[PDB]
Design goal:
about 300 residues, monomer, 4-stranded antiparallel sheet, Methylamine Dehydrogenase, Chain H, mainly beta
Length: about 300
């Protein structure tokens, strides 16, 4: 079934964050050099580039309903830009350490940031980007934050402390803590989007990807095959597959019903760091950022 087309790729400094715009034919990339880029992957032309800082820009997302991008960099700052004009909307120090992950609430004016300072912070853009909650309890770097798309009053944080914590907005203690048995930590967490299964997925430096039932807490499956640290693993929005990427330089596509590998790709850009999927499955697009640039693929 996998009819993969190489839509667009670009060689650059290491790409640490990547995101699809939901309606325009664009990907955002955030680079180790301190630049961020917006590319039109159909025309293969850059829309806009910004020198944000001199430090790596480690995380970035579109906020499409506000005409913004939001980015987090190793100078500890969150910055927001209007992507049509380049105007800087806000610039603040978010944490006293690196920002690993940013998540944008789908219907309320909230952003989450996860950090090496052991916390997740919630910022409200309709309250002047005020800090409104700090979620405390993790015991190592918070590597990834993700709202539950089926209930975005809750979100998951994946941590090098080997746990995922699931939290409710407004509550200081997690709803629960999942101990993953991934002894090298959790680098990534993602929710399965459909209502038939209460599942999430974690990736680790211990070479494993694990699928979890967050109601029963059982490990449903372990996907083995990567040979070095697994940077991410996600459920595709529209195809019954999982995409993972690793410091072994590969992307892997896995069947999300049988949990078997379907294809392994070495796109020739060295280590893979980050992932995005087009949110409504336009062309079943995925994109990944690597040491040496990024690629956009249509999976069929």
């Amino acid at each position: 079934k996998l009819d993969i087309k190489k839509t667009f790729s670009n060689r650059s400094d290491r790409v640490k964050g990547i995101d699809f715009h939901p309606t325009e034919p664009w990907v955002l990339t955030t680079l180790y050099s301190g630049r961020v880029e917006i590319w039109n992957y159909e025309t293969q032309v850059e829309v806009r580039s910004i020198q944000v800082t001199e430090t790596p820009v480690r995380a970035g997302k579109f906020i499409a309903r506000k005409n913004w991008i939001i980015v987090g960099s190793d100078d500890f700052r969150i910055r927001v830009f209007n992507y049509n004009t380049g105007e800087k909307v806000v610039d603040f120090e978010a944490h006293p350490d690196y920002i690993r992950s940013i998540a944008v609430h789908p219907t309320k004016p909230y952003v989450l940031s996860g950090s090496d300072d052991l916390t997740v912070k919630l910022w409200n853009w309709e309250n002047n980007w005020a800090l409104e909650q700090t979620f405390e309890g993790h015991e190592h770097f918070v590597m990834c934050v993700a709202f539950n798309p089926k209930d975005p009053s809750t979100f998951a944080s994946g941590c090098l402390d080997r746990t995922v914590k699931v939290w409710s907005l407004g509550q200081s203690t997690p709803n629960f803590t999942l101990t993953t048995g991934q002894e090298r930590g959790v680098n990534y967490v993602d929710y399965y989007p459909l209502p038939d299964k209460p599942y999430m997925i974690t990736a680790s430096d211990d070479l494993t990807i694990k699928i979890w039932d967050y109601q029963t807490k059982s490990c449903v499956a372990t996907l083995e095959g990567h040979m070095s640290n697994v940077s991410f693993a996600v459920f595709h929005p529209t195809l019954p597959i999982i995409i993972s990427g690793s410091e072994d330089g590969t992307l892997k596509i896995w069947n999300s019903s049988t949990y078997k590998v379907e294809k392994t790709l070495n796109v020739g850009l060295e280590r893979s760091w980050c992932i995005a999927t087009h949110p409504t499955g336009r062309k079943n697009y995925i994109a990944s950022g690597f040491d040496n640039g990024f690629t956009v693929l249509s999976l069929g």
